[PDB]
Every structure is written in structure tokens, then in C-alpha cells.
Symmetry: C5
Subunit: 264 residues, 5 copies
């Protein structure tokens, strides 16, 4: 594709969306929405059979764009994105673990943040901590696309997929593919540990540039804008025991798009 000049003047639009987290309890009518079910630990490598509701997933949405049609395409220039609800973790009166008469123990542990903006679905590369996990039916996992062997514990280049279903691609089996995603920008960070404190910043003043080194943003070839994210804040522990749940937060996107002339 030949990328020609930007249009000027009617030539800009803003697309906003909130994506809700898909932490395992993905049903908005369930009392534990925004969390996983209680995590259970395998008795052996060969008996590792996690239920769908115990794992966190990627969130994704395709936003329809105004129709345009040289050819014109919407070009994503920049995004303001925000993870909403760190303030909710300041609740330490809920039914939580307690030391003596101290406050309820807040959400802590491993965190995983990523967002992406693109003109087509996010490209995913499969990879697993254990090749022996028996994933439940009704997900997309590396077994969905290739023969799973010990190679999946490193880089098996046959384990390719696209993020095309909200709440069904587990984060534990799928990474953004750095060998593809020519038409997507993705950003993420991971911080491990069992009891690590979570960290978040929030503002409406920070713009993420989506232009590549040539000044070109993602091009929305199909009249669709693709938003993807995951925002795991750590584990919650209810006062009913020592079982833990993943806790995730929603993410806002406000994407600025401009009309770009193109030729095949």
C-alpha cells in the first residue's frame, strides 16, 4: 500500500470506549463480576485442569468507524487511555483477611497491564508455562491452532492466532506477537510476586502517540478500530478462607483518528 498525504480541515474524529475486564467471572449479573473464581492449584502436572472462570483473559472490541469512500482510510494518530478504579483498592473494610484488629488485607500480587490500538485484530503468539495443562473447552488456546508439545514452553512459531473474541483468549497462553502487528501498536508491563503492592497512575493529560517511525498510525482498512487490553491488579482474599481471586479493572480509550489518502 502507498501511504499518501493526510487530509486537513471534517478530517478528524474521536472514538471513545470502556472495555470491562474479563478476569474469569465475565457475566455482569454474577456477584463476583470483575474477579476470577477462587483459584485451585493442580495436584500434579498431569491433572492441571483449570475451569474457564479461574483464569484472566484479554478484553477486545471492534468499534465501527464512519465510512469514507484516491482511497481514504482512518489513521489512528494517538490515544488517551486510563485504567479506572485504583481508588476501589482503598476499601479495607470488606470481608477480607485481617491481622488482629488491623484493616482488611488489600489486593496484592502479580500485575499484568497491556493495551493495543490497531486497524485489525491483535496478532498473538502462543506460549505456556506448562505444555501439560488441559485447557477447558470453549476457549482459544494454542491447542486450537497447532499440536502442543514441550516446544510451547519456549517459542513455537506455529502457535499463531488473532485476538478476535472478548474474554476467551487466556493471558497465560498468549503474548502479543512482535513478529506481526504491523498495523497495531501495543504496550504492556508485567510485575510478578505473590504479595507485591500494585501501582497505578491516572490522569487525563497524557497522550500516547500511535505514529510509527515514518509518521504513520494504524490504518483502519475494514472501517473498524480494534481495541485490546488486560489489567490484572493482583489477587483478592476474602475473609471466608485463604482462596484467592484475580481482580481486574476496566480501561478507557479515547482514540484520535484522521483521514489518510492511500493507493494500492
Amino acid at each position: 500500500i502507498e501511504v499518501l498525504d493526510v487530509k486537513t480541515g471534517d478530517s478528524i474524529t474521536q472514538i471513545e470506549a470502556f472495555l470491562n475486564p474479563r478476569m474469569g467471572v465475565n457475566d455482569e449479573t454474577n456477584t463476583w463480576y470483575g474477579f476470577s473464581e477462587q483459584v485451585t492449584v493442580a495436584t500434579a502436572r498431569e491433572t492441571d485442569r483449570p475451569p474457564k472462570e479461574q483464569m484472566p483473559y484479554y478484553s477486545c472490541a471492534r468499534i465501527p468507524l464512519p465510512l469514507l469512500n484516491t482511497l481514504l482510510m482512518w489513521e489512528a494518530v494517538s490515544v488517551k487511555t486510563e485504567v479506572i478504579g485504583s481508588n476501589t483498592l482503598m476499601n479495607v473494610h470488606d470481608y477480607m483477611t485481617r491481622t488482629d484488629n488491623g484493616v482488611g488485607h488489600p489486593v496484592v500480587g502479580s500485575t499484568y497491564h497491556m493495551f493495543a490500538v490497531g486497524g485489525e485484530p491483535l496478532d498473538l503468539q502462543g506460549i505456556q508455562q506448562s505444555h501439560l495443562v488441559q485447557y477447558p473447552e470453549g476457549l482459544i488456546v494454542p491447542k486450537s491452532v497447532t499440536d502442543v508439545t514441550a516446544k510451547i514452553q519456549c517459542l513455537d512459531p506455529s502457535a499463531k492466532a488473532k485476538l478476535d473474541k472478548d474474554g476467551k483468549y487466556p493471558i497465560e497462553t498468549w503474548s502479543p506477537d512482535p513478529s506481526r502487528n504491523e498495523n497495531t501498536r501495543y504496550f504492556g508491563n508485567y510485575y510478578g510476586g505473590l504479595t507485591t503492592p500494585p501501582v497505578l497512575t491516572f490522569t487525563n493529560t497524557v497522550t500516547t502517540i500511535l505514529l510509527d517511525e515514518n509518521g504513520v498510525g494504524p490504518l483502519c482498512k475494514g472501517d473498524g478500530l480494534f481495541l485490546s487490553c488486560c489489567d490484572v491488579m493482583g489477587w483478592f482474599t476474602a475473609g471466608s478462607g485463604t482462596h484467592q481471586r484475580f481482580r481486574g479493572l476496566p480501561r478507557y480509550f479515547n482514540v484520535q483518528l484522521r483521514k489518510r489518502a492511500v493507493r494500492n
Copy 2:
């Protein structure tokens, strides 16, 4: 509004203000002002009934501005400071102690945010638990919409404006990134039970309030809207293991300029 040129020459004014923390003991005559009451923890998810004095709140105020009329005061920049980190170096108070060591200082989860705008801060409701029973006299998501499990994620019906000091609990309200066109907000959160608090302080740092088009917040009705919350963690008195939130005050020095608008 079509924004026109800035004025030059009496064209600039500074607004100086502070907001005291609203940590639950919000009465300046109470011996525990600047703290919450002792935090109690629910016996069940269905019996979670926190008293108003045990939770921290947003602070807010509207500063009246010189009447201009059109002209609007435009907020260009702010110097803001959280005052009092020095006070946490008191380890001789009636505090928990290991053997004959110092008093255990304030530690735990921190929540810092400030906002400067030309109208009240837009809030989005969100909660850790949809089953919490909030006390009478507060503004919570239940004040504006039916509260269901959707409130644990993003329920777009849970919209409010920060329009009362010490009444909007931080645990139920986020700054709304989908609104606040006429406000700049900034914040950071760090969790954990015993995490060390961190603060910087200086009079040399200016926060720019101009947007990408070089336009600051425009003060509707000649009012400047300031908002904040500065939770430093929990204090533990030597009388037991019960903990209290501890907050600190925030200073604002806002530079405003006159901006013509259509």
C-alpha cells in the same frame, strides 16, 4: 466556545488555596482530625456497613474569581504541594513498638490525586463490592443509579460531580476520563498493607494546565474548582492493633490569565 486570544499587561492573577484532608474525622475540633476513626472489617460480604468516619473522602472547594463581564479566567499552570511528610518522622507518639524500638510509623496504601478545573470534577462510580451498605448522608453510586454487580466494573449510569467536600468516598468514585473536558486531574496509587509512603516536596515544579491546543481550563461562572485526596497509609495507636487512615493537606497556587471567548 470559540476560544480567542489571551489578554496581555492586570491580565494575570494568582489564586492560593489549601484543602485539608477528609479522612473520616472531618471535624477540625475532633482530637483525631486528619485521620479516620478506627477501621472495622466486615464479618460477611452481606453485613458490610462501614460507618462514615472510617473511610476517606475527596476534598474540594470552589474559589470565587474576580468578575470579568466575553472574558474567562483560564488556568495556565499550578504549583501544588502535599504538606506534612515531616510529621511522619514522629516515632515517639503512643504507637505500636517492637521491643524497645521506635514507634511504627504510618505505612500502607497511598492514594494521591489533585484536579484543577472550570467546573466540578466529573466522577465515575466503581466499587470493590456491590454489596456494601453505605451510611446515610454520603454521595455514593446508590445516590445516582441502581447498584448491581456491574458497579464492580464500568457501569456508565454511575455518573456524578464532585460538588460536596468530605461526602464522596474515594473507594466508590474515580475521576471520569470520558468527561472532564474542562478539568485537568493527576493521581497515583500504590497498594499493600505495610508499604512505605513516598513523597517529594519543592516550590520549583510547575504543572502546566494547557491542553494540546494551548488552552487551559476556562472558569465557568468565575469559579475555580480544586479537588484532591492525599492518603499516606494507616496509623496504629499503641492502644491496640486497630488502624486509622492518615491524610495530609494540599496547597495550590494557580496562575490564571484572561482569555477572550465568543
Copy 3:
């Protein structure tokens, strides 16, 4: 009313070390550079700390060279260094020990601040507890105003100037961001009971003191006002579990230039 800088003669460097005032403020005392052992109150109403158990601000007024529309010395920039982090690598002293391991080094809360100005640092009073009974011979909020629960937040009547070395406790006084027009201050705080101390040192970093208009602090009466505090945490001697504040000295090298004024 600030006019043009002079050129050519027209620059001077002023150097000083300020020794820490950690409570043992007497350079002939064997515990100089430390506090006395910290005792913890038995009750909120019986909190009576001896002067030697609390850290203080350090300060000095450095007389300046002759230079006389008048001229004033304008502070352009400073190189400042906390000296002695290397001393904390001593783990063979009479210290707490785990089995046959090293002596437990200084850890805990840190408070660093420095200021350079043309008049004394303006201080705002604020306290963790309004009920502390401060000893005689200090300057505390009680020295300037009625102490009430308001002092746990911002009581704007609690104003003072840092005009005595080793007498203004850090636990009752913050640099005042509503004043200090003619001073630049910088500080950071990191809490916790056993947090590791962190320090950088170099002779290659210059702190600029010029404001947004290119004007540095102007030295009234030809005096340069330096202020600091550098608490590194607590030391624990092998004689028990009682702890002492440990502080380090700070070096300043301020570049001044001659400035014409009305």
C-alpha cells in the same frame, strides 16, 4: 524591582558544610550526629519527648562579599551533596546481629531537604499529634499560635522562619509553599520501619535556582541562607533494641552573581 546582571568580578562561589542536628547537637558528645535513644509514649496525653530524641532542621546564614540602584547577590545555582553514605558500610560496630551475620546497618524512614534563599526559610507548622508536650528551648507551633487539633492538618496561623540551627524539630515544621518567594527548597521523604536508605553522590550535578523569569534568590542584607535536614534512618546499638536517628552532613557550593535592583 530587578534590573540587569553585571558581567566580568561579578561571580562568587560560597561553600559551606552544615552538620546534622539529630538531637545530640553537641560536637563534644560521643553520640554527635545521632539522636539519644528514642522512647515511645505510654499514652497520647503523656507524650513528652526530650529535646535530644528528635531531629531538627540545620541552618546557617553565610555573610557575603562586599559589592556596593543597588546591587544584590543573586543565587544562580548550587552543587549540594550529602556526605558520608560510605559510613553506613560499617557493619562491624557494636550493632544488632542475626546469628554470626554482619551488624544490622542503619535502616528506616528518610527525610532529605535542602534550601537556598536570600532570607530565612518560611515554615508551616503541622504535627502528627496535637497533644505532644514539647520540651523548653525549642521553637514549635505552640511558640507562635494556639495548638489545637487543627495542627494535625493545615492551621494557617502556625507560621515561623527557620532562624535557629538545631531548634526547629522536623516533626512539627514543613517548608511553607505559600511563602518562600525568595527561597528555593527541595526535599523527599520515604517512610517505613526498616526501609533501606538510598543516596547518590557526585560533583557533576548543578541545581538551577533561577525562577521562570530567570531570577534567583536575592540576598537581603548580603546574607546567603542555607537550610537542610538529612535523616538516613535509625541505628540500633548491640546494647539493646533502642534506636537512634542517624543523620549526615550536607555540603553546599552556591554560585552567586551581582544583580542590579531599584
Copy 4:
């Protein structure tokens, strides 16, 4: 070489992509513990320290042959690289057969981390250095003993302990450092964070370019039309629920190197 001007236009730029798999000790892709070490055993004495090859992490390396460009000569010059450590998301699996506290989650991978990558026009130069001069390294590895007499000097800088990274999965990280006194024609980057239970930290993106040009605007020159990639990415230790024995866990690294044709004398 006298370095002359860059070439311009159609065909003057090429991109080389590769994934390098980690060599954590279990280096066989058919083994059920691929991407991990074998269970780490600790010496009973300084003089009985005999680690099996499968219990130690290694440098990964590959030489990628480049397009034909000659018939002044031209060399491919590495300008920049996008590199990514893949798979931090896999550490969010806390349901596997792992240690747990009461009914809490499986204890995830934690501990010491070692990240390094290098891009060059010849093999990475290595400097030998060891925690203990008394370790008895197993047959089939390349260690300082391979190139010099090992003495207590190896616990500091013994300048006789020089080697080139010329074999994947055979140079243990615990005996070899990138040599800052050589590597004129390679750029290397790394970070280390120690501790027994330290949380691992990783960022990932496709928007960050690492510039490989030196102070004179010259990148690594592929003197033999080969691009040399090297790395190690230790994430910490994994603990299986079968015991308290630990395994190193590593992750693969992606490289996408931009090269341009450079005239040389």
C-alpha cells in the same frame, strides 16, 4: 576498514527477524522441562562443587546469513533493533502444580533476573569471571578453564580469560561476561537484579527502537555478511509442588534488526 557513505534507494535497507529460544539447562525442545533448568542442587563443600550441565543457564546465540550485496565494497550495517522478551504473561499461570500457602495461589516464578541482548557484525567477545575458582565444570561446556589456567584471579578480572560466544547453549552465564574491552563491532545491553524471592519485572511493546549507531553514526558492520545475535533472559526460579527444589525459568527473545548497505574501503 575506512567507512565511506551509506547507500540509498530501493534495496539499500533490509530487515532480519529471529526468535532465540532460551538455554536454561534443559536445552532439548523434546524434553518436558524445555525452557527450564533441571532441579538445582547445592554443593556440600567448596571443593565438591560439581554442577551438572542441565542445572545452569547459558547464553543463546545465532548467526544469520545476510543477502548478497557485492559482485569500494559494501557491508551490511546494523542501524537499529526492536527486541522483545516474549511470554511474561505465562507467569500469570498460578494453577499449575506449584508450592502454595494454605489454599492460596501457586507461588509464581521469583528470584534473580538476568537480561542481556547483543547485536554485532562478529561473535560477542566474552570475559571469564566466576564466583568460585574451585567449581568443577562438567565436560562439553566452554568455561574459563577451556582458554586459561583457572586460579583465584578468576574471582576478579583475569585478562587471560578471553573467549568468543560461538556455540549456543554451551557458555554458562555464571562464568562469562560481555567483554567491555573488546566488542568494538557489537552493541550489548543488559540488566541484573538479584535476591532469592525478588518479583520479576518486564515491559513489552512494538514501539521501542534501540539505536545501534556509535558516536560517529556507524552501526555494527557485518564483515562476513553474517549478523550475530546473542541473549540471555533468566526470569527467576520456578518451584514445582513436588518439593522445595527450584528450576531456572527463561523466556525467548525476538529481534528485528534494520540493516543498510555501507560502502567501505
Copy 5:
């Protein structure tokens, strides 16, 4: 003071000087089986009986590198000095701390406990020895014979626990100036650039970055680097990574790592 004139240009106006400085952690003898470590640290039974053996404390490393001779004709109204423009410096051997199979402390069947605790990194490049300011945690320590400590240069009193401006020395001997008694002096070192960082704690994880792509500029605010007096380049460092604990007990040893320097120098004219 040296009156600085123009930089020279062209062939042979530039040279690069490289060196490795080995750490001096207490076991300073390269033939000793614990080279690069301290002897096992012992803790005083009282403030008045604090008598540390010289092998139990880390020291500053230093070297003077000879430079090409510049000034054979001392009648000239202008002379030349080597000016240090920049340095690439690297602490080598963080990878060695990934050895957790050595004879080390262990929890159950877990890995050997690696080096952790307080870190102290510093390096300096100058045209004369690094200026040192004495300062101590305790004025009562009895230092062993054959070291240079504040007592070597002044009367040691409680003042030494803060800033005693009489405690001045120059870093002129490798492995003899303990880090616990000497700081780089910010009131001198006009002709040296120094850089350091300290992180405390008993079990803090050590942190290190390494690369060959980072240049440290040595030019001052006037564009002038250190000027090499007597055609000597002075390098100084210390790189304590924490404490090692052998499986023979709970006694701990300091562990240090070597540092590389590659200094770019240029000829600078000065008034004679």
C-alpha cells in the same frame, strides 16, 4: 590555577586509555582463595572494643595510568595537557551472582542464597588523586596498622561522626583507604569527576546495568575535562555488591566486582 586555551585537532590529538581495576574487599591478594571478597565479618562486643581486622573491610581501588609525554620544551609560552573528555565504564561480573549451586545457605532443597545487602558503587576520573573527606559511624573504632584512616591526618574526636574539615587526604594507595572512613570530598576535586550511589539494608537485592553504549561526559560547565598533571590519568572506584554467606555458617563476607574504564583524552593547550 591552570589557564585553559584551545583544544588541538588532527592525527594523534586524541588517545584512548583503558584499564580494569580489581576490587579491594579485604582479601586483596590475588593468590588467596577468597580474592574479591572480605574475610568473614566479626561484630564488636562493645563500642570501646571495636578493632576490625584489615581483611574484614572494603577499600577504594585506584590506579595512575601513565600518558604519552607532551611537553619536552618548557620554554614555550603555551604547553599541552591530556584532557579527559569522556569515559565508558562498566562493572563486570553481575552474571557470576547467578551461581546458586556453590556451597551456600539454603532453605529446604531451594537454591543457594545469593549475594544480597548493602551496595556501594563509585568511580572517578581525574588529572590528580581523588580528594577524600574523613567521616566515620563511630569515633571509637581502633583501626589496624598499615591503613590510611582519619587518625593518620588529624585528631579523631566525636566531630568525625559529622564533618571535621581537618580530616583531608588524597586517594594515593590502592587497597589501603577503607570506604567506611572516607568520602569523595565535594569541597575539592576541581580536577576530578566522581559518581556514586549507595543502597543500604541487610538483605537488599543487588541491581546492576551493563552495556558498551553509554558514554559519561567529563567536561565541566565551561567545556573543560580533567587536565592530567604530570601526564598521569587517575582512576578510582569501589563496587560492593553486598554480602556472601557460605554454607559453613552464618558468617558473611563482602563481595566486590572489577570495573573497566575506557577514557577518551584530547590534547588541550594551557598558558605557560
